[PDB]
Amino acid sequence: GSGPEEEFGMSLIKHNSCVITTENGKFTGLGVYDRFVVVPTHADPGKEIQVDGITTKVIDSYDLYNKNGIKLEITVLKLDRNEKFRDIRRYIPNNEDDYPNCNLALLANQPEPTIINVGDVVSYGNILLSGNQTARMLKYSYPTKSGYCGGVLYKIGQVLGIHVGGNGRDGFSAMLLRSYFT
Numbered sequence: 001g002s003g004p005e006e007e008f009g010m011s012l013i014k015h016n017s018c019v020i021t022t023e024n025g026k027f028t029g030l031g032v033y034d035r036f037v038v039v040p041t042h043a044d045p046g047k048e049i050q051v052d053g054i055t056t057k058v059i060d061s062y063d064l065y066n067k068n069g070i071k072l073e074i075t076v077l078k079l080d081r082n083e084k085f086r087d088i089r090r091y092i093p094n095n096e097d098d099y100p101n102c103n104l105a106l107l108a109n110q111p112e113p114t115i116i117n118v119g120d121v122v123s124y125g126n127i128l129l130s131g132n133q134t135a136r137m138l139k140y141s142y143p144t145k146s147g148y149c150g151g152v153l154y155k156i157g158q159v160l161g162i163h164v165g166g167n168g169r170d171g172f173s174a175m176l177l178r179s180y181f182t
């Protein structure tokens with residue numbers, strides 16, 4: 001793609017993504033609004049992180065859980081930094097759904113901002129991700145790689161999830177829902 005789906009993704013990368021460095025490596029971070037960023041929980045961000053290489057204090061953080069206490073693999077961080085992210089909450093769905101023809105927007109661990117077409121996405125339920133129960137997964141059939149974590153799953157005008165894992169054949173994102181941020 002070089003048309004609208006790719007273009008919406010590149011704009012999303014430029015305005016609402018960042019590279020988050022923790023002790024566990026580099027992750028694509030999604031800026032949701034103001035100083036709030038999401039990252040995969042397994043990034044294990046501490047009291048300080050790097051945001052695009054800049055040491056940055058985390059004012060607060062919290063992990064998300066489903067109704068039975070199962071991790072969603074999303075962590076919300078509020079960052080001590082001057083820059084504010086453009087508010088993309090209106091692009092986040094209200095409800096779980098399936099989505100045809102999705103892309104992933106990748107920044108961390110890539111030589112340049114990268115957009116991948118992962119194809120059709122389904123709401124898959126709970127999985128075991130490195131042995132740990134994880135809820136509200138979105139599944140796609142694409143051979144994702146180790147550096148894709150935090151990558152933003154999207155369609156035009158829809159910010160759907162963040163990449164959390166895979167097995168070489170299937171890829172999984174944590175679902176983003178508007179109520180998490182509102």
Ligand SMILES: *[C@@H](O)[C@@H]1CCC(=O)N(C)CCCC[C@H](NC(=O)c2cc(C)on2)C(=O)N[C@@H](Cc2ccc(F)cc2)C(=O)N1
Nearest residue numbers: 042127128129130131132144145146149164165166167168
């Ligand atoms: C990013 O940090 C990384 C992305 C890896 C990836 O996309 N890929 C193909 C590498 C293989 C990783 C092996 C794990 N996969 C699974 O467990 C799995 C389950 C199913 C149904 O399909 N695959 C995996 O993805 N692990 C992630 C780290 C993690 C650790 C603990 C958790 F609770 C959650 C995630 C991972 O390596 N993601």
